[PDB]
């Protein structure tokens, strides 16, 4: 019943910027910390970033540290990732994932859980 | 100077001589009220330091952002230009928000402590 | 995989007991001994906090007895103390052709009492009512306080009006409230609130016949320690009240003499018009009604068939085996027996006739006596009936009056409210491991 | 929702109000001991966070693992399906063991902390 | 031990029994003011406590260097071979310049990590 | 040896007309008055 | 033997037994106590 539905822009030039939104239904939004995980087209799955339940504490691979920005809406139970810099080596599929982390009162995760369809970004 | 010696200095003068005043807050039914009711506000204002998230501290600075509202002056005429009294006095009709503020933003970090604690 | 993380401020508390103190808003009462009320007090609502009540073991009435008591000694402190009066007094009958349930009481008494200067006597005549005046062998009398104590002369300026007192925790403890409106004193409250402070409270002093204060919202409630042991009070609290209107209709002429350098002394001078007697008119129709739902409510704890008999007290000091109330500032002491005679099986007003006495012995104490001065004019108070005083005495059960004991008119309206000590601090299991 | 509002939800739930409970710990003979017996048992509940290594705190986490016998149940159980009043029921056995735990860990702790300001 | 049970025992091994007597410093009008005068001198040790630097701590370690003319005894001399009473009555004419200095250490440094909070 | 500091630049309102200090004063000295004359002796046999 | 000063004879000297000497008092008369009311509430003991 958990549905996780990506969306945002496609094929950017270099240089530009581009802001990716995740819709979610079917659990409570603010139980749940959520991730975003990209898969190169010819390559396996690398985690991107991390956001905790209440939106306060964020995680990002080296190689997006400066130039991502994630954030989440528990009121509109929307996620979004806001992309800069847009280099050649970021052309994948990007996953919404629910899972990825606890909060101390809850049981740990340390895993991905629910995964969204997933949207092509290019550059 | 003395307690309250500063007391005419400038904000960024009388902000030097914190020990000395701090020192001078602890040192007959009525009397013995009167020791009960000033050691019950001594509690009250170190509990309001403590919830701000300021225990052992006479200078503490925190995440709540200056509103300009509050007051829209230089940092070169407050500190250089005014007295501590002046400053009360202006800035009297908003204590009670900006303490507000201070509560609610030690309760996010305090628990943000906590889950930054719990990543193995 | 846990640690143990600490927490302040936790919201849990523990049975306690601690003081209290009053807040309010001359009078034998007063307003210096209490702290200003708050104009907009809080009451928070526990959506699902359950809390086990017991008004029979609530010491929020023992100190509530003991702060009554105090107010009213401190209030006797700077007043007169009538020792010049213990003498011997000579007395004939003040109207002795009356045919009225009065013949025999009111007489008048003279005496030599004490002025302003040691060496002089003055004779004083003064009208005295039987209850207060003991036969020693006109006739040679004394007054009633002489056998066993002193009597103080309650200052005239002082009003005995009851003041609500609203009873307010210090801080580190609070006061729940049940707010449930089938609560019988003892056991569970579903809906319990916390309040800084009660409510106010009069302090109503009265025997069988509880005067003034709250009511039942949706029946009536019967409240007993144990209801099968007969030894224990039924405490009744009604739904409706019933008017009582009681008036002393003697024109009463109040004159004052000086006994001493400072010190005065107020009797009954005499009596302008026709001697009458003071009553309290209580209606049939109320009064068969409170009752039928008092039996219908008492058939539920003794079964149904049973015969409900009420009737009239027995034995023991007026104060016990009358309707004991302050009236204007004079003490009636009401018969009651047209009310409590009925028995139950499966605008036609009712008179009380009252007795009035000025040497009262309150609390039940021995040695301290107030000497409650004559009030010029007649006198006339209108009063809500809000609960009873019943005592269990086959088929048929017997209820009469009872009372006395003044702890049993404030475990009435203190039976809704309980003293807990907050205890913020405590542990529980998390995934928080400190740094280290 | 105010002073106890929390006490009836859950633990999870009630953690979040701890400022509005602590800020009402502070807030005649008898009456003037009551006040004083309130001001003791306030500095005794402090004295005992200080020395767990608590001070300006109101959520600290700890060293002490938990034994599992003090209560073996999930965190899904207690913070999620259990109040603050059924927990300190529960455990009201062990809280002069825990306590105890709790200071001979600040004690090794504090040492520990001297001894490694003692390396050039 | 218990309370002051090692009080005829050296320094070093008193050390280690800290929070002993920090829990007994806590545990009729003159009696009533016995109370209150206790409190004012817990409150009082504790403020001092909190001026040098040290609040939920038990030991803490200073900036002010040991000037040898207030004691010029070896470590292996105070810690292994003399008590608490003895060391106190051996300074007890230093330690109004001890704690003089105390404060004004912590008045630098709280001033300066004032100013390390303000490089962006 | 008590110690008086001077404040070289405060102003402040004064009114003697309002100080609650003289009301103190006046309680305690009739309280002092009247306790003084507790441990004595009362003229009632003079009112002759 | 406990003094203040011993050589000083205008103190007191405080001696304490290591053991107990036993004394035994005795007020031998039969004594009859009869009771009298002075005032309202007030009453003298007296031997009769
Ligand atoms: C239950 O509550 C009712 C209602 O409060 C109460 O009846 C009321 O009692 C008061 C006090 O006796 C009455 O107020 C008096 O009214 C008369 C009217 O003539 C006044 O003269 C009185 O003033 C004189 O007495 C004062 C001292 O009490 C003096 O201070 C004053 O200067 C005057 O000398 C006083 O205002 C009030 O009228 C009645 N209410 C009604 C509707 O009659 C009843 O007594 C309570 N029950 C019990 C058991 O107390
Ligand atoms: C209250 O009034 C009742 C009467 O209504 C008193 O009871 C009566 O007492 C007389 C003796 O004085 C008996 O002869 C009557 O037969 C009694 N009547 C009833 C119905 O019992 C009662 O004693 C009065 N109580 C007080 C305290 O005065
Ligand atoms: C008072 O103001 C003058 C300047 O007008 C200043 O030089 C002096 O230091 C001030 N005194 C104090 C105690 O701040
Ligand atoms: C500053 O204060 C005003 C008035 O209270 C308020 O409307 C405004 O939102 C405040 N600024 C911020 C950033 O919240
Ligand atoms: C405050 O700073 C601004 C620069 O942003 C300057 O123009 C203004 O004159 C300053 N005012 C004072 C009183 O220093
Ligand atoms: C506070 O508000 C009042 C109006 O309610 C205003 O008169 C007063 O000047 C304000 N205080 C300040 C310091 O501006
Ligand atoms: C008052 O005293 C006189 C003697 O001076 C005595 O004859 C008289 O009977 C006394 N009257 C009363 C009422 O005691
Ligand atoms: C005097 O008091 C006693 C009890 O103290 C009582 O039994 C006796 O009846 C009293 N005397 C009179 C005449 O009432
Ligand atoms: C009051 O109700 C409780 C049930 O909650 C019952 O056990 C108790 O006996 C009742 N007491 C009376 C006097 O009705
Ligand atoms: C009083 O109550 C207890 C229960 O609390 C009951 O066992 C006892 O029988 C009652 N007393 C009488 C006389 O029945
Ligand atoms: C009492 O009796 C005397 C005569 O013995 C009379 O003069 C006096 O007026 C009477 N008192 C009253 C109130 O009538
Ligand atoms: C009491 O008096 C009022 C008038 O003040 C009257 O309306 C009412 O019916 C009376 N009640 C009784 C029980 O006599
Ligand atoms: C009055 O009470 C009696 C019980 O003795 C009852 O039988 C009668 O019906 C009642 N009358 C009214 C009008 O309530
Ligand atoms: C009569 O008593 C029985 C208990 O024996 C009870 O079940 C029934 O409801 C009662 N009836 C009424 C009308 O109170
Ligand atoms: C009134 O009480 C008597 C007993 O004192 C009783 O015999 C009589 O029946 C009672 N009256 C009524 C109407 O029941
Ligand atoms: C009592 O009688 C006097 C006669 O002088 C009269 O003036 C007064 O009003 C009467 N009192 C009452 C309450 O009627
Ligand atoms: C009697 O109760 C009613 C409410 O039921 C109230 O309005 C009225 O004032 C009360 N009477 C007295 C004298 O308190
Ligand atoms: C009370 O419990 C209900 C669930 O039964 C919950 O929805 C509600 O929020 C709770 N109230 C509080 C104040 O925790
Ligand atoms: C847990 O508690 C039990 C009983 O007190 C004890 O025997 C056991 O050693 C404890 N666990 C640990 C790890 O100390
Ligand atoms: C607790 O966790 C275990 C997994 O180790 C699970 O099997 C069990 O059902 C859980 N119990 C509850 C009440 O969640
Ligand atoms: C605490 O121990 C007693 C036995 O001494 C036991 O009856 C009680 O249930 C225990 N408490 C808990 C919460 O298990
Ligand atoms: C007392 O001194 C002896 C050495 O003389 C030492 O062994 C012993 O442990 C000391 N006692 C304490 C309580 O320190
Ligand atoms: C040590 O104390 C002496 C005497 O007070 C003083 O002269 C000396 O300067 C002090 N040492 C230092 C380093 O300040
Ligand atoms: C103190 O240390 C010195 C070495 O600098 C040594 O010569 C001296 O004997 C030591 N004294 C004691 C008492 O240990
Ligand atoms: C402190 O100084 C006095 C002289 O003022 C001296 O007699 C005393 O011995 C000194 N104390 C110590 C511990 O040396
Ligand atoms: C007590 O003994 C001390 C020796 O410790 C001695 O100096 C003193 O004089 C003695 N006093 C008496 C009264 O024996
Ligand atoms: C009392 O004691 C002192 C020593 O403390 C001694 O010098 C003096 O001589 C004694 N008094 C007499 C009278 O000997
Ligand atoms: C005292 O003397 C009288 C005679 O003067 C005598 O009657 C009385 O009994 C004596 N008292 C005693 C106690 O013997």
């Known amino acids: 019943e958990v549905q996780l539905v990506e969306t945002g822009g496609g094929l950017v030039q270099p240089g530009g910027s581009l802001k990716l939104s995740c819709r979610a239904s079917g659990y409570t939004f603010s139980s749940f910390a959520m991730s975003w995980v990209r898969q190169a087209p010819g390559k396996g799955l690398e985690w991107v970033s991390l956001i905790n339940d209440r939106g306060g504490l964020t995680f990002y691979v080296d190689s997006v540290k400066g130039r991502f920005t994630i954030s989440r809406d528990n009121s509109k139970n929307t996620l979004s990732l806001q992309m800069h810099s847009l280099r050649d080596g970021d052309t994948a599929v990007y996953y919404c994932?629910?899972?990825?982390?606890?909060?101390?009162?809850?049981?740990?995760?340390?895993?991905?859980?629910?995964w969204g369809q997933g949207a092509l970004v290019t550059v | 100077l003395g307690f309250l010696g500063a007391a005419g200095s400038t904000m960024g003068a009388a902000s030097m001589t914190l020990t000395v005043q701090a020192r001078n807050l602890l040192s007959g039914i009525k009397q013995l009220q009167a020791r009960v009711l000033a050691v019950e506000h001594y509690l009250r204002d170190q509990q309001l330091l403590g919830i701000w998230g300021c225990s052992g501290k006479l200078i503490c600075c925190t995440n709540v952002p200056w509103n300009s509202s509050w007051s829209n002056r230089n940092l070169s005429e407050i500190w250089d230009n005014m007295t501590w009294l002046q400053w009360d006095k202006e800035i009297s009709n908003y204590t009670q928000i900006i303490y507000g503020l201070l509560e609610e933003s030690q309760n996010q970090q305090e628990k943000n402590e906590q889950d930054l604690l719990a990543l193995d | 995989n846990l640690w143990v993380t600490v927490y302040y401020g936790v919201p849990v508390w523990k049975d306690a007991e601690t003081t209290l103190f009053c807040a309010s808003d001359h009078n034998v009462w007063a307003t210096h001994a209490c702290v200003p009320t708050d104009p907009n007090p809080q009451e928070i609502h526990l959506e699902n906090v359950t809390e086990e009540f017991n008004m029979w073991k609530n010491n929020m009435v023992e100190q509530m007895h003991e702060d009554i008591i105090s107010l009213w000694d401190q209030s006797l402190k700077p007043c007169v103390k009538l020792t010049p009066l213990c003498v011997t007094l000579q007395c004939t009958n003040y109207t002795p052709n009356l045919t009225s349930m009065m013949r025999g009481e009111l007489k008048n008494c003279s005496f030599n009492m004490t002025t302003e200067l040691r060496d002089k006597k003055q004779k004083v005549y003064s009208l005295f009512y039987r209850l207060d005046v003991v036969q020693i062998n006109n006739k040679e009398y004394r007054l009633i306080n002489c056998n066993t104590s002193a009597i103080t002369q309650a200052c005239p300026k002082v009003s005995f009006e009851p003041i609500p007192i609203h009873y307010c925790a210090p801080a580190g403890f609070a006061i729940l409230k049940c707010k449930d409106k089938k609560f019988n004193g003892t056991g569970p409250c579903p809906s319990v609130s916390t309040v800084q402070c009660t409510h106010g409270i009069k302090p109503v002093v009265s025997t069988q016949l509880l005067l003034n204060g709250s009511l039942a919202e949706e029946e009536v409630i019967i409240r007993s320690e144990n209801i099968t042991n007969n030894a224990k009070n039924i405490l009744v609290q009604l739904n409706t009240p019933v008017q009582i209107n009681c008036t002393r209709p003697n024109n009463n002429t109040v004159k004052s003499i000086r006994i001493g350098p400072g010190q005065a002394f107020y009797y009954t001078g005499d009596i302008i018009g026709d001697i009458r007697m003071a009553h309290c008119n209580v209606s049939k129709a109320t009064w068969n009604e409170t009752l039928g739902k008092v039996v219908k409510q008492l058939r539920k704890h003794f079964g149904n068939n049973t015969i409900i008999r009420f009737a009239q007290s027995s034995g023991g000091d007026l104060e016990v085996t009358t309707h004991s109330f302050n009236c204007g500032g004079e003490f009636f002491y009401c018969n009651t027996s047209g009310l409590f005679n009925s028995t139950w099986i499966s605008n036609d007003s009712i008179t009380l006739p009252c007795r009035i006495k000025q040497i009262i012995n309150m609390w039940q104490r021995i040695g301290q006596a107030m000497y409650a001065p004559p009030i010029q004019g007649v006198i006339r108070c209108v009063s809500n009936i809000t609960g009873l005083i019943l005592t269990r005495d086959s088929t048929t059960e017997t209820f009469r009056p009872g009372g006395g004991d003044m702890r049993d008119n404030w475990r009435s309206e203190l039976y809704k409210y309980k003293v807990v000590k907050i205890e913020p601090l405590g542990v529980a299991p998390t995934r928080c491991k400190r740094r280290v | 929702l105010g002073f106890l509002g929390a006490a009836g939800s859950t633990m999870g739930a009630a953690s979040m109000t701890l400022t509005v409970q602590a800020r009402n710990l502070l807030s005649g003979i008898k009456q003037l001991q009551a006040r004083v017996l309130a001001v003791e048992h306030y500095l005794r509940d402090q004295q005992l966070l200080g020395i767990w290594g608590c001070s300006g705190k109101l959520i600290c986490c700890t060293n002490v693992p938990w034994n599992s016998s003090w209560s073996n149940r999930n965190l899904s159980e207690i913070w999620d399906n259990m109040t603050w009043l059924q927990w300190d029921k529960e455990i009201s056995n062990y809280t002069q063991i825990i306590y105890g735990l709790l200071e001979e860990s600040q004690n090794q702790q504090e040492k520990n902390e001297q001894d490694l300001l003692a390396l050039d | 031990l218990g309370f002051l049970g090692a009080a005829g025992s050296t320094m070093g091994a008193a050390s280690m029994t800290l929070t002993v007597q920090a829990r007994n410093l806590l545990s009729g009008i003159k009696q009533l003011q016995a109370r209150v005068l206790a409190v004012e001198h817990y409150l009082r040790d504790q403020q001092l406590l909190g001026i040098w630097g040290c609040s939920g701590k038990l030991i803490c370690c200073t900036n002010v260097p040991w000037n040898s003319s207030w004691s010029n005894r070896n470590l292996s001399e105070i810690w292994d071979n003399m008590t608490w009473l003895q060391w106190d009555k051996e300074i007890s004419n230093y330690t109004q310049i001890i704690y003089g200095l105390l404060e004004e250490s912590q008045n630098q440094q709280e001033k300066n990590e004032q100013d390390l909070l303000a490089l962006d | 040896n008590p110690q008086e500091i001077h404040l070289e630049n405060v102003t402040e309102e004064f009114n003697m007309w309002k100080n609650n200090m003289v009301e103190q004063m006046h309680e305690d000295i009739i309280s002092l008055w009247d306790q003084s004359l507790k441990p004595c002796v009362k003229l009632t046999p003079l009112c002759v | 033997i406990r003094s203040e000063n011993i050589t000083n004879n205008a103190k007191n000297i405080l001696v304490q037994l290591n053991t107990p000497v036993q004394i035994n008092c005795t007020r031998p008369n039969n004594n009859t106590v009869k009771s009298i009311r002075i005032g309202p509430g007030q009453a003298f003991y007296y031997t009769g």
């Open positions: 994932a629910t899972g990825g982390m606890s909060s101390a009162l809850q049981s740990s995760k340390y895993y991905f859980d629910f």
